[PDB]
């Protein structure tokens, strides 16, 4: 019954992974219709930051050799015209490098074997020109998407394994995967936004969490566990920079378990060694990115290591609150002093944009930079609609009941005031997961898009309902009752998710890009609003100045100079700014110059940080008249070189 149980667990985990893969692939094909889309139309299908990430994969796959392509992307001079950036460690383009390195020999060997891995045929659109839509794994878009979706299908398997581990039964894993499937809409968006960074990294984060829970539960240690933890920590760190903050909230949880004597010395030593090695390897592979230091993930590693290694000196302590308070003070003080001892100390001055959004939510910090995030409706507070939708499937009540049950059992099977440094308190993995859930819930409430962390942890915590420790016939007959009532309110969400189809494109941007193909030189420099620039670089291969990945330092002031053409600045000043940056064309929309909810239109975001220039006629008040009157009289040095159906306007810098 022990070989049979474990083998069935393994098999069912693999099956749910495959089912999740097929489900997301179906939702993608229903959303973006790549089957009957041309290669250049699929590129336009990747809006804002996805077009920038895919463009470097396209760059590498078209290079004469892989080394030349990676040399192109490490000494890139096109993404930001004016200096030479290394985009590999700068946008986290390791998934693109790996996928391109795998794709090139694949196609090269396909030609030798004469395999027809790519199948396609002429397709006609009607009013527009005929195009070619191409199928097969040999197509580059499909190779990229298949890699993404194979990685993202294992999230369900990791959730199944975590449900089994935290409850020690198969009913718990079933409850977790069922709650993940019936709330699949809120858990992930890899169907809608495949090339995003979170789509490549979150599977590795949840795999790392599962491995850590396994290591804690069975008190494992040694080299073979350091390898397993590092092999899932390094890929997550290379991808998504934000992974570091995730790995911070993990450490904050681990400490809280350790301070309650639920983790032995050797296991905690193994865990911290794995983090040390993974951080070192990630720092090396990212070419010594000075951002990794002065984050919260490195000081936390050092602080937790110090607390672990000075723990045996405190064996004789007996009053538990004093011990916990002492270790908490040491942890917070060491991590904070190391952060400020490197930011405002050695003058490394990391990127503080996480803290700029948070200060604007509670205080009155306006900061046009933050206004570009706070009105985006994805760096806003969680909406009541999401909460009601999570309560509709009864996910929140189930996790809440499991949480209160765990609190009851923990408080009434452990001496709170008096501790023995020789007795481990048991059930540390459950406490670790509960604290991780609390951290993820705080993050998800503050900034929506961090719900990708909260919802699977809600599923894992709801999986606690099948823990036998905390009559067989009564237990099995009521667990199936819960599974049945879950099916009654989760099938509608699956059906509704599968019965939605996306809009059918728009011909404006294709016409603009054709005009740019034919009426501009290949080395022209372009400026404009951030979503358009990534598309203008992906296809049309023109050098640009500003791009959507505005996070780091070196592009932040460039956007504030570029978007000054929507301000109340004089024509001469903006023309001189454009000339100094060295752009030839400026591309924008008339829906970017509209006038209900001030402080998120550019005409109102330029009065908070430019109050001397209020009262003078706005530049958009001149563009929306120079396009209508069809003459570029009032804008003397500006010429409206492209205008069609009053949607896209391309001005040319004299």
């Amino acid at each position: 019954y022990s070989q049979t149980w474990l083998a069935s667990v393994v098999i069912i985990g693999l099956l749910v992974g495959y089912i999740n893969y097929q489900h997301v692939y179906t939702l993608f094909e229903n959303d973006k219709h790549f089957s009957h889309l041309a290669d250049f139309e699929r590129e336009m299908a990747y809006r804002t930051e996805m077009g920038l990430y895919y463009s470097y994969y396209k760059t590498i796959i078209n290079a004469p050799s892989f080394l030349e392509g990676v040399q192109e992307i490490t000494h890139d001079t096109v993404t930001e015209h004016g200096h030479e950036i290394n985009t590999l460690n700068r946008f986290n383009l390791y998934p693109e490098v790996i996928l391109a390195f795998l794709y090139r020999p694949f196609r090269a060997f396909a030609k030798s074997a004469n395999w027809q891995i790519e199948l396609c045929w002429q397709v006609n659109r009607g009013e527009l020109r005929p195009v070619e839509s191409c199928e097969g794994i040999g197509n580059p878009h499909y190779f990229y998407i298949t890699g993404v979706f194979i990685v993202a299908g294992t999230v369900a398997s990791s959730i199944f394994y975590l449900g089994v581990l935290v409850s020690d039964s198969i009913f718990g894993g079933f409850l977790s995967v069922l709650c993940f499937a019936f709330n699949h809409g809120e858990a992930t968006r890899v169907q809608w936004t495949p090339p995003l960074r979170e789509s490549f990294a979150f599977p590795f984060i949840i795999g790392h969490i599962a491995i850590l829970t396994f290591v804690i539960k069975y008190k494992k240690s040694g080299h073979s566990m350091i390898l397993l933890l590092t092999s899932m920590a390094v890929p997550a760190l290379l991808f998504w920079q934000f992974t570091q903050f995730a790995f911070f909230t993990q450490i904050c949880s681990i400490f809280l378990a350790f301070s309650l004597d639920l983790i032995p010395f050797s296991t905690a030593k193994t865990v911290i060694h794995s983090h040390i090695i993974s951080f070192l390897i990630g720092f090396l592979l990212l070419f010594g990115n000075e951002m990794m230091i002065t984050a919260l993930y490195f000081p936390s590693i050092l602080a937790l290591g110090m607390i672990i290694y000075i723990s045996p000196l405190l064996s004789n302590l007996k009053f538990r609150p004093a011990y916990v308070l002492f270790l908490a003070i040491i942890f917070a003080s060491i991590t904070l002093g190391l952060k400020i001892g490197l930011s405002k100390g050695l003058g490394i001055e990391d990127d503080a944009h996480i803290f700029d959004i948070l200060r604007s939510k509670f205080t009155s910090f306006a900061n046009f930079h933050t206004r570009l995030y706070t009105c985006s409706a994805e760096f806003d507070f969680i909406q009541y609609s999401t909460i009601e939708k999570l309560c509709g499937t009864l996910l929140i009540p189930l996790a809440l009941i499991s949480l209160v049950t765990f609190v009851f059992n923990f408080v009434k099977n452990t001496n709170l005031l008096w501790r023995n440094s020789e007795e481990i308190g048991e059930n540390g993995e459950i406490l670790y997961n509960v604290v991780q859930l609390c951290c993820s819930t705080v993050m998800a409430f503050l900034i929506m898009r961090l719900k990708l962390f909260m919802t699977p942890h809600l599923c894992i915590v709801a999986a606690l309902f099948a823990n036998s420790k905390l009559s067989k016939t009564i237990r099995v007959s009521a667990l199936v009752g819960v599974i049945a009532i879950l099916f009654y309110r989760g099938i509608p969400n699956i059906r509704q998710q599968l019965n939605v189809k996306g809009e059918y494109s728009n011909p404006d941007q294709e016409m603009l890009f054709d005009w740019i193909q034919h009426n501009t030189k290949q080395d022209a420099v372009f400026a404009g609003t951030m979503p358009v620039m990534a598309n203008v670089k992906l296809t049309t291969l023109r050098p640009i100045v500003n791009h959507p990945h505005y996070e780091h330092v070196g592009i932040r002031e460039r956007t504030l100079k570029v978007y000054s053409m929507f301000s109340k600045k004089p024509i001469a000043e903006v023309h001189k700014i454009m000339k100094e940056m060295g752009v030839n064309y400026f591309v924008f929309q008339l829906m970017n110059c509209s006038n209900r909810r001030p402080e998120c239109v550019y005409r109102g975001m330029w009065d908070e940080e430019d109050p001397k220039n209020s009262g003078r006629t706005a530049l958009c008040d001149l563009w929306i008249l120079a396009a209508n009157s069809k003459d570029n009289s009032r804008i003397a040095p500006f010429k409206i070189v492209y205008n069609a159906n009053r949607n896209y306007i391309v001005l040319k810098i004299l």
Partner: antibody
Amino acid sequence: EVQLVESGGGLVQPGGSLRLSCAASGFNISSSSIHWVRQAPGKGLEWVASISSSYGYTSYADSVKGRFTISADTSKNTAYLQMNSLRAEDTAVYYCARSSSVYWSWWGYSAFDYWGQGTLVTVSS
Amino acid sequence: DIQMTQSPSSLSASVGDRVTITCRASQSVSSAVAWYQQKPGKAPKLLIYSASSLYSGVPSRFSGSRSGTDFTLTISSLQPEDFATYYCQQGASEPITFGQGTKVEIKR
């Protein structure tokens, strides 16, 4: 010199209640904890209840938890132990011992150094 | 939930004979144990705390040793005034629990 004195013992009826007092001279109370220990004829010594008056922490033994009550006030430098619903085994001599405050326990309670003399309480139907 | 077991319940030895009394705790309190002496009709008085630190005023013929969870109280030269009952207590947990209580008698 600091020293402990007890009062309130005697003879009572089973099922009744009684309150007894432990006063101290010298050191001010609320800088330390005080505890109650029973001694029965031919038996050993058994800790009963404890109080720290610095912020009002009270603890009991499960054998007497829910019936006995400890209330130590600082101005009079005295504490009160009040017991209700007397059983048939509560007949014993009580000692008011002194230990370190619980907030400063930190490696455990200090040894009972300055014991009280003790008062004998009896229950008989 | 924490308790002491004491094997030498009653020990009889002559005056001047070395006597050793043991104390074993079920849990693993580190060094938060103490020894006490009580005379019949009198209140107990503290002798040794922290399992090795002799108290002040008590004579220097009481020695306290600790090995792990075992503790031992030793008198090298038993004397007529050192005839009472002895107790062993821990203070590392909220239920403070003494020992059974050993007695020292006179050889005759």
